[PDB]
Short mmCIF file of C-alpha atoms (C1' of nucleotides) in Angstrom, two decimals:
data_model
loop_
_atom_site.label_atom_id
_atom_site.label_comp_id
_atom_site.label_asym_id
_atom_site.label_seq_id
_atom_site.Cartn_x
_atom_site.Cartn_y
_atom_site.Cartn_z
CA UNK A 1307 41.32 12.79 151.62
CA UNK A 1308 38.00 13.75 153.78
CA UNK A 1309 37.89 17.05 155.34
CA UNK A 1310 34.83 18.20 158.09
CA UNK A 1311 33.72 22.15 158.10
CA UNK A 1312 30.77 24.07 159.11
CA UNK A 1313 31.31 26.77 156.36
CA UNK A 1314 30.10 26.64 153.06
CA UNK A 1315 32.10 25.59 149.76
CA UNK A 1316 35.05 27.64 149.84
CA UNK A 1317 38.28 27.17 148.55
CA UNK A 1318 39.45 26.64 152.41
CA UNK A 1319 37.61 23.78 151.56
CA UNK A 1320 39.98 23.06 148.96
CA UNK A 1321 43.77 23.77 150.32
CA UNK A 1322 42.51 21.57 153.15
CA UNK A 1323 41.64 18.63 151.23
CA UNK A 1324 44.49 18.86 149.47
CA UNK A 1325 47.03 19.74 151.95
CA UNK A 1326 45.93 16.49 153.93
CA UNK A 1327 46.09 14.52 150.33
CA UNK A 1328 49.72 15.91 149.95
CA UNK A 1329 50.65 15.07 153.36
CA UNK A 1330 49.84 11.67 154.84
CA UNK A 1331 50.09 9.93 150.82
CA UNK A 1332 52.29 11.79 149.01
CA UNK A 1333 51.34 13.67 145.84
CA UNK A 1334 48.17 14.53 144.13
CA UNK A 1335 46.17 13.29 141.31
CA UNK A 1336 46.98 13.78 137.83
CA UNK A 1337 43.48 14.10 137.06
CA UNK A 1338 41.18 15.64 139.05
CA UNK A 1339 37.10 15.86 137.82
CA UNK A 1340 35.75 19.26 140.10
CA UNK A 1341 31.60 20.06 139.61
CA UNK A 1342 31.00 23.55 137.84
CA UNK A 1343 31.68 24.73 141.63
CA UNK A 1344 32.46 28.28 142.21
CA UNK A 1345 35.06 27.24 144.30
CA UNK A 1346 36.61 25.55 141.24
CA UNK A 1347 36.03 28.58 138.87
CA UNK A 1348 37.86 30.79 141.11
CA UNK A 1349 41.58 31.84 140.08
CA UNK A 1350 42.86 30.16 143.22
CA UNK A 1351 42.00 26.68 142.99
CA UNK A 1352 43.22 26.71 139.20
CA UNK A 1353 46.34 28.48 139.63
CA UNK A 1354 46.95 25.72 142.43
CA UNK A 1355 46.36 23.14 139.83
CA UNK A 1356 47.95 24.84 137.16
CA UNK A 1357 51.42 25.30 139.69
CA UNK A 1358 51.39 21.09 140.84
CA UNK A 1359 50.52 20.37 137.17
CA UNK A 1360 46.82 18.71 137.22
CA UNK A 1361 44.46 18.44 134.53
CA UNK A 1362 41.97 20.42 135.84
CA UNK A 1363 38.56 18.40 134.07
CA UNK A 1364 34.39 19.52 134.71
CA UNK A 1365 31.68 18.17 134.86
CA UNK A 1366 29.08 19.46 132.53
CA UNK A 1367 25.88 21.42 134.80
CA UNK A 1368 23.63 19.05 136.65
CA UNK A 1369 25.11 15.89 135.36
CA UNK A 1370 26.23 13.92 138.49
CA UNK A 1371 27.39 10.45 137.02
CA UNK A 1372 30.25 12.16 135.59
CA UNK A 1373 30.86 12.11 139.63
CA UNK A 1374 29.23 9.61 139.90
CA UNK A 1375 31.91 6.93 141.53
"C1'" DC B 258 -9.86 -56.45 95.60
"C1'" DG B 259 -8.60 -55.46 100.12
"C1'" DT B 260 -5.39 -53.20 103.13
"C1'" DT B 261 -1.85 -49.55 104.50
"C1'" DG B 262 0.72 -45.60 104.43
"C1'" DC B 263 0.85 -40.80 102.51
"C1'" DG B 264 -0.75 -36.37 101.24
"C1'" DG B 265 -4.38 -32.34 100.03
"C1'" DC B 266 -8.49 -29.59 102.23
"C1'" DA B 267 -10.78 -27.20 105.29
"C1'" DA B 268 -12.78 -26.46 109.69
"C1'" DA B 269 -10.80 -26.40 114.68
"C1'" DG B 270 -7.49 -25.38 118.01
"C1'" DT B 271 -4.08 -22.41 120.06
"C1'" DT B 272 -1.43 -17.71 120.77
"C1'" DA B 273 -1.29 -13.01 120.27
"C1'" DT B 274 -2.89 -7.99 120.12
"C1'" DG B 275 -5.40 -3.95 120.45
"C1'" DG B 276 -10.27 -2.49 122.30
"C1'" DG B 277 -14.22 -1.89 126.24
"C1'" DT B 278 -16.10 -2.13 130.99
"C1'" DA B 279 -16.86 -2.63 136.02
"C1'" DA B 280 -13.94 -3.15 140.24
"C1'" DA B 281 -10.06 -3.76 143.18
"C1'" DG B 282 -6.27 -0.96 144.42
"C1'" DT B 283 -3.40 3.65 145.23
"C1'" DC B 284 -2.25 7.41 147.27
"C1'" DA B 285 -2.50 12.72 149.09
"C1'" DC B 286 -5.48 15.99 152.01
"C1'" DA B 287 -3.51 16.35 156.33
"C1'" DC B 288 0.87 24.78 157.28
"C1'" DG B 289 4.69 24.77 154.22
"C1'" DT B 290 9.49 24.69 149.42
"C1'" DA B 291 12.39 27.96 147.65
"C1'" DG B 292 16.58 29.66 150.06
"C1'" DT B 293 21.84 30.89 150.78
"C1'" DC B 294 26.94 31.39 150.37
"C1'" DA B 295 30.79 31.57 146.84
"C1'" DC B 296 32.53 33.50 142.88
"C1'" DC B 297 35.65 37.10 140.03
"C1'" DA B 298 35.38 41.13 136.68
"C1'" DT B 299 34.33 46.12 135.98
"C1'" DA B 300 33.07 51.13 137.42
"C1'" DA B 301 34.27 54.52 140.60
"C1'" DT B 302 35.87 57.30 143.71
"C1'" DG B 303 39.18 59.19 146.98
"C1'" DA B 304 43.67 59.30 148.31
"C1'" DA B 305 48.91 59.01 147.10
"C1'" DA B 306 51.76 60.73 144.20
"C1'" DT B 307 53.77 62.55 140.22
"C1'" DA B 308 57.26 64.73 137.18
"C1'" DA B 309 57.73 68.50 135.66
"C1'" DG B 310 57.26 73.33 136.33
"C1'" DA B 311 57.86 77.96 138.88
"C1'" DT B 312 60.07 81.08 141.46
"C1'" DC B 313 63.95 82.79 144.86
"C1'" DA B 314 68.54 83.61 145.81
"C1'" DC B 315 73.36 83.98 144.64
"C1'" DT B 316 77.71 84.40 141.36
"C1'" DA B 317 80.05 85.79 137.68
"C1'" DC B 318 80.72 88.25 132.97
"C1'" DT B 319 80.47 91.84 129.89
"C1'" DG B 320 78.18 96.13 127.14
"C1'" DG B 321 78.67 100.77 127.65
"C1'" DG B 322 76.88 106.53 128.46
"C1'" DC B 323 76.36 111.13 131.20
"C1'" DA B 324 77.66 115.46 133.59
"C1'" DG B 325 81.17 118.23 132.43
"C1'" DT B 326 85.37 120.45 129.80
"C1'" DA B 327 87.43 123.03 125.95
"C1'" DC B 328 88.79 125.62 121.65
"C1'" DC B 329 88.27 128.26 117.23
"C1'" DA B 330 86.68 131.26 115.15
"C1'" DG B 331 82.03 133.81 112.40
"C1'" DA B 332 78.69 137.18 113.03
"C1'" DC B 333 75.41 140.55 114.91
"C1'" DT B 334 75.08 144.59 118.11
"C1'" DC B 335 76.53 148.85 119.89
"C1'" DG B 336 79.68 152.41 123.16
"C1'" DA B 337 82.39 155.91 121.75
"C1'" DA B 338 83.93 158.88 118.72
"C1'" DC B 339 84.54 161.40 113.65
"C1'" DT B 340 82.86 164.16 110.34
"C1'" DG B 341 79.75 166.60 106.90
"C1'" DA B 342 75.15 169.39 105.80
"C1'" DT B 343 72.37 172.85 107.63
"C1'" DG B 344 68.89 176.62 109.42
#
DNA sequence: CGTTGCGGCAAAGTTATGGGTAAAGTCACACGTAGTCACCATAATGAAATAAGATCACTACTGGGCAGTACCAGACTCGAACTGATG
């Protein structure tokens, strides 16, 4: 899923990504490796994960290859 | 006896490695790197509201006393009269 925005990272960010992900494939990862973000350390994002059931996994601070692909 | 192959000995030959010295390269000085949302818990009021509390008003139930009435004598006081001593 690819998603285009002028605003910052913000968990819009997010329910868009993921709302196009669940909508022209199918389902969502099982997976899913998030930087040390702040939109991944809010409540929202990991409630969101928490209710579709996805291991929720981080990166450790300003490591990228753990990202890297 | 002479010749031929083989092996020890000791320079000599070839790589390698850590030093020194001039000399070909290399690259920044050219105004600039810090700067900006996103993030969720805690204090912290100020308002919203409380749950109980406070008082009014009414209804019914039950203690219960005061101004007044009434009798039966006992007892002190005194009009009215009786009666004796007297100067």
């Amino acid at each position: 899923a690819v998603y285009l925005t002028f605003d910052s990272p913000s968990y819009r960010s997010c329910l868009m990504v993921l709302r196009i992900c669940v909508k022209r494939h199918g389902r969502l990862p099982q997976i899913v490796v998030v930087d040390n973000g702040a939109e991944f350390h809010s409540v929202y994002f990991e409630t969101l994960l928490a209710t579709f059931e996805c291991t929720k996994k981080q990166r450790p601070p300003a490591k990228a290859r753990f990202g890297s692909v």
